[PDB]
Amino acid sequence: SGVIKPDMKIKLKMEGNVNGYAFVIEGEGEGKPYDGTNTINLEVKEGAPLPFSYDILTTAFNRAFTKYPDDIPNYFKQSFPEGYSWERTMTFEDKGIVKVKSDISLEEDSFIYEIYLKGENFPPNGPVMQKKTTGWDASTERMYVRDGVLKGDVKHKLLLEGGGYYRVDFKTIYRAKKAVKLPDYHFVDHRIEILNYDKDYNKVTVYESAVARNSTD
Known part of the structure; x- marks a missing residue:
């Protein structure tokens, strides 16, 4: 049987620092790895x-939660039980930058994430x-292979109050902790949202869906 069950729990801790402000966030959740939801x-x-x-934190809160067709090798699911890590650079159009790294492990039916995030150079009135x-x-x-590991690039956008976009380029490198069958170039379509939040975002719920598809259609 599979070490990745159809219902998996999530535990995480993030240590963050944004424009010099330090913070710590803990999380618990669940998802359906084969349906690509969490x-x-x-x-x-x-x-x-x-x-x-x-x-600027939500996409840091695991591509094991991606629906994949059987004919596209699944870099993320193949990596377990050993797991994988990722490191990401988010370059914002006004020269803010976030660098974030996460280690994804598995214990029984929970994924465990250890996340470190550093955001710098955000304009104070941005x-x-x-x-x-x-x-x-x-x-x-x-998603595409470079130097034996998997890269993911996103030409992303944050929506602004009052309309308009604030563009953000994502560059992620995903590193499996064992040899896996590598996929060809393909796409992962995402939608992430904040479902609910209290006053100052002390307590927040995030949802994401993610589905892979070929690059040849």
Whole structure:
């Protein structure tokens, strides 16, 4: 049988620092790895109230939760039980930058994430530090092998209060902790949202769906 069950739990901890503000968030959730869906409930443990847009954290809160057709090798699911890690750079159009890394492990029927996030150079009157974003657009991530590991690129966008986009390029490198069958170039279509939040985003629920498809259609 599979180490990845059809219903998997999620536990995570993030240590973060954005424009010098340190914080700690813990999360618990669940998802359906084979359906590509996941929901995480986050709680700020240190650093409340967060003085920046929560949207710069949400995509850090696991591509094991991706629906894949059998004919596209699944880099992420094949990596278990050993698991995988990822590191990501998010370059924002006003020169803000987030670097985030996460280690994804498995114990019984929970994935465990250990996340470190550092955001720098956000303008003090920009949409991030002034909490004027409303969420991410739906996106498509381009997945392809480089130097033996899997890269994912996204030409992404945050939506702004009052209309308009705040563009953000994502570059992620995913590293399996064992030899796996490598996929060809393909796409993962995402939609992430904040489902609910309390006043200062101390308690937040995030949902994401993700589905893979070929690059030859």
